[PDB]
Each structure stands twice: as C-alpha cells, then as structure tokens.
Design a protein around this nucleic acid. Sequence first.
RNA 1: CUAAGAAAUUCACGGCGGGCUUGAUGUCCGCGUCUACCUGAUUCACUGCCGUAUAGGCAG
Lengths: 335, 306
Amino acid sequence: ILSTASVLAFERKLDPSDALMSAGAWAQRDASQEWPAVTVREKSVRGTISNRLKTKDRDPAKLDASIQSPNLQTVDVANLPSDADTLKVRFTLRVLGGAGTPSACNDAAYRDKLLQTVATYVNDQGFAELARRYAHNLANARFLWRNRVGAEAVEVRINHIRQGEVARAWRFDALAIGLRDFKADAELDALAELIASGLSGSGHVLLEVVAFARIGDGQEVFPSQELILDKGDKKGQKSKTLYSVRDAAAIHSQKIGNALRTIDTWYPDEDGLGPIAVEPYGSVTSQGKAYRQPKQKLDFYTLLDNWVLRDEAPAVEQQHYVIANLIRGGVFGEA
Amino acid sequence: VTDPEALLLLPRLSIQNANAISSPLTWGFPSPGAFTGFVHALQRRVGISLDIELDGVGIVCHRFEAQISQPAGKRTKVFNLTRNPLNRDGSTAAIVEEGRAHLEVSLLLGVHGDGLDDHPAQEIARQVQEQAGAMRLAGGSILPWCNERFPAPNAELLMLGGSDEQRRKNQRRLTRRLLPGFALVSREALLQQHLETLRTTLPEATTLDALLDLCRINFEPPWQVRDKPGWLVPIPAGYNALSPLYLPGEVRNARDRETPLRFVENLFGLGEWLSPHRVAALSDLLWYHHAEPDKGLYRWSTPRFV
RNA sequence: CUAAGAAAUUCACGGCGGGCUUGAUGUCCGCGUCUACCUGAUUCACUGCCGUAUAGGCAG
C-alpha cells in the first residue's frame, strides 16, 4: 500500500564549519592570511532596570529602590582592534552530494520510490534553482548576521579548493547582491553550477568562503553566543558567553548553515520577510511563527507524502522546497 | 583479530562537532566504537573497490576541545548547546542536551588484502583520504584542510619489513609523525586485576566499583593522594545484550528490515591514554570489533596490546 | 554503515565615590679552574681588453 518509512533520516549536505573571524584593514584584504584573530574578552556592564513592570510592582518606592540595586554582569565582548576597520570572517563549505539518498530508510519500496522521485526531479530540473540561491547566500554575506547590518562594504571571496589549491576563485560585492532578490549573474551561475555538480556527484566540493566587512575602527563584531543553561550563582555569573574556537572568535557552523539555507521564498504567507530558512513547518526563530503549517497542505511532510506515495507532484516551487529539505537533512518518521 | 599487512595513516583530521557524550556514564573523548564504525564504513565505501580490508583503528587525538562551560559557583561542568528550530506552533522545542567537541585525531588503519599489490600505496592512501573527507567521525564533520600552509598527506606503511631494524626505523618514522597526541588503548586486564586487589581488600566488589576506583583521585591518611600508573579513563568498551535476537522484519521501527535487531546496553571498560612511543610497535594499539553474537557481548578493544 | 541521522541563544546596559602601610636592622668567614689544539675547506668567480652588443671571445 506504500506506507511511509517509520525511520527517515537524511544527512546534511552543504556542511559548513565554524566561521573564524579575524581583523585587519581594508585595501590589504589580499594579504589577509596573517590577520590577527578577533579575541573574545570580558567586560563589566552595569545597567538599570528596563523590562516591563508587572502592574503590581509599579509603585515608585520599589522602582526607585530597585534602580539603587543594579544588575552587574560580566559579558563577553568581541571587538575589532582600534587600528582595524575590517572584519574577515572565514569558513569552509563541503557540498557533499547524494542529495536524495537517505541515510536511513526502512522500506525498500519507499526508498526506491523516493530515489525515483528525486531522479525525476533532477532530470526534469536539476539543482539549478536551489544552488543558485545557495550561491546567493554565499555571495551576499548573509552568514555575516549582525556583522553585515551597518558595514560600509562587504566583499565575499569564494575559492573552489581542489586537491591542493584554488581551482577557481570568485569575488563578489555582497551589498549589491541583496538579501532578498535571487537574480541572475554569470559568476553566480558558475558558482551555482559548481554547487550543483557537488550536490549531484558522488564526492564533495570544497569551497573557502571569506567575507570582509568594513565596519569601522574598534567597532563591535557579533560572533555567535553560546546556549548555556545553568549559568550558576549570580555573583560570578557571566551573563553572555561568545563562541570562540581557539582564542579566536567564531560563528557556529549551524548558524552559517542556517544563513545558507535561507532560500525559501515559496511559503504561502506574504513575503514581508522575503526568504526564510528551509525547515519542515517553516519556522522563523526570530519571528516566533511557523509558516508552512500542516493545516495547509504546504509543509515538507505532506508534500513529500503526496509526491512520493501517491505521486501528486506539487508545483516546481514546493518541490524545490522539498529537495531543499532533503539537502538540509532531518530525522523524520512516525511511530 | 588478524594482523595488518600494512598500516595506513590518516593524518590529523579536524572534526568539528563530535559526540562528547561517549556513554551514559562517561563524557569527553568519543567512544572507540565511533572510530571502529568509521573504519568499517570506510571499508564498506572504498575498501571493497580497492580489494583491501580496512580493519582496526588506532586513535591519537592531537587536539581536543569540548564545548563545555563551568558554571559560576559550581565545581562541575555543563554543555554548551545549539538552538533547534521551533515547533509548528511557534514554541521553543524541549532541549535535548548533546555534547559537542572539536577533535584533531589521526587514525592508524590496519590494511590487509590483495589490493596492496594491485595498486600503489599512495593511491589507496589518497583514495581512503578523499573518501574520508566526505565522511563524519563521531557525528562531526571532517574539516578538509583548505588553504593552510600545506595539506597533511597520508602514508601507508607496509608492516612487512625486510629487516627488524628497518621495521623499527619506519615505526619510529610514523611515531614521530603522530607524536603531539596520545594513543588510546584498552586496559581491561588492569581493570580485572584491580578488581582482584579490591576483592582481597573487601569481598563482594563489582568491577564497576573497581573502574570507579581507577577513575577517582583517592586521598589517603598518613595526607597523600594515591598515585596511578597512567591516565586511566573510563571508556564504553562495547555493548551487552538485553533482549533476545529479533528477526529482521519482526521488530518495529528499525533502521533496516533486513538486519536482526537486539536491544543492547553499554559495557564500560577501562582505557589508558598513552603516548605512541610507549608501545614500541604501532601494529598494536588498533581497535577491532569482537561480536560473539550468540551470547550478546558486542564489544571493541585493542587486543595484541601487551 | 560511527548513542547513527537534524538544529540561529539574542536583544539592551554608567561600577564609582574615598583613603598616610609605617618604624628598625652587620650577610660573612674560606677557596688552584686546569689540560691540548691546522680555520682552511680551489672560499678573492678578479681586473681589464676586442666587439655595436647584454651575443661571443681574449690577456694575466
């Protein structure tokens, strides 16, 4: 009857690493291999209360006595040096390939039907709309999350690293390439064809993505913050911990991947946001709202069941979203 | 099991989010089952085409960084987590604590087969490294070394030496290459004889308690701490059966419906982080599997260590 | 065929108000550093001439 597989698991294609941020001066970005790393240090903050009072503690005695007892935090802070106006954020991206083959599948019938469906997609329309948008989110530095929002000039350099060296090098103006328009370009189409040939082939394509952002002298850079439950007793508590690999500030690999996946302009709600990240029940953690609900027939599970099980193929946009989830990975399956 | 004809060296592989939770009782470096399963996946993916049998792995760990943090006013550590996506209603998902660790290990693989003759050594070393670059080692991605000073290449050392001096010479040449780390071996004879000593001390002792006794730092009255021979970590040395062996299409929600499933449970043994020139033969210190599936007792160790 | 497979911690912040560390003090007796050597391995790829030449030759 072709029931769904009780265990489905797709591996993560487009597997980035931690985006190492270092620092120096613009117009020597070409010699940015000995740029010193942005280090994460501690500073002390003292703040007043600013959160909303809960309509029982609004009286002026408790408020005035509560600004006399301030919260005192040691936060982690990563800044550029006072003689460096450019932030160099560097990571590596593996585009693995075998994008429709699941890492775990119970039913050989469902596995063969899903491989037949993925191959029907790839022959009918390959990884050319998906990888164009992945190449956009590389080319505009969306992985520079808050490190992009005030930069004078962002410039992304992408190097196809072959067996020992750069096989083909790109260089983009990341502020001309917007964060919401997946347009066409010759060099973007070359990078998209490379990411397509990676996602199709049996081996990985390795890229080296370096993005320089001209922020300003001594300004704050924003590496990823660590999800630390149980910070401890409030005396020596560090209220904010910034991520750093080896005395060198960094962005998490899943944050870089979340920026790379932001290709989904196909969700049924209006695009006041533009692209969101490709997720089953497509849910923006900053918006707190899950688009692509199952009350509509436009989430990944209903579309994959209709496409593979009963051959109701969706539109080309929703099947881009389905194959983008298969590139994204995930652990699917009912009881 | 069988002795390696050659000894392949995957060089320092950078793994970015490896499983720090080795087992329900141990954290830290990932289990040796991860590395033995990785080398069996390397055999399963590239070794059946080169006509070789990649069997046995030696774990070295040049660099280790756990994504842990020590909370304020606490002596112990907690794990730094990742922020998962939301539910379909917009709420935060229930947090499942996974430990992530950044490794830098180099693996010594036992290679034996007829494909050692049919192919060059550097060709099969390059092929297993280009296949390992698309893989993962404890749940974490193998960082593939782009645009540093030089890429670390391989070396497939044929263990068959024409002389014992040449064999000691290129064991030294390989040990110098994998030197800034610490080879991980299995000392279960030491665990059993420590259990025997603890049983002559106090009767009715379990070797869980002897394992703990090798883990602690014991303070002794006249004050001095009790010294230990080596590093002596607790490792999960395999699995033990809980259920009888179920048929392939009989258990529900398995990985595949063509492999017999059996509910198992960890078997915590003793390890020992020692430097690679304390072994004097690198064809030892390789972790193999030992199943004996009729009893249960699916386990890994490094036999032929001492 | 790896306790397999999957993942955005993040938004904001005034730590500063102030201050006498002072007195006092024996480092000190004594001592065998000898012995013996190739810096020279072509180690100064020089100075000049004929030639339009950087091409090529020549002298001491």
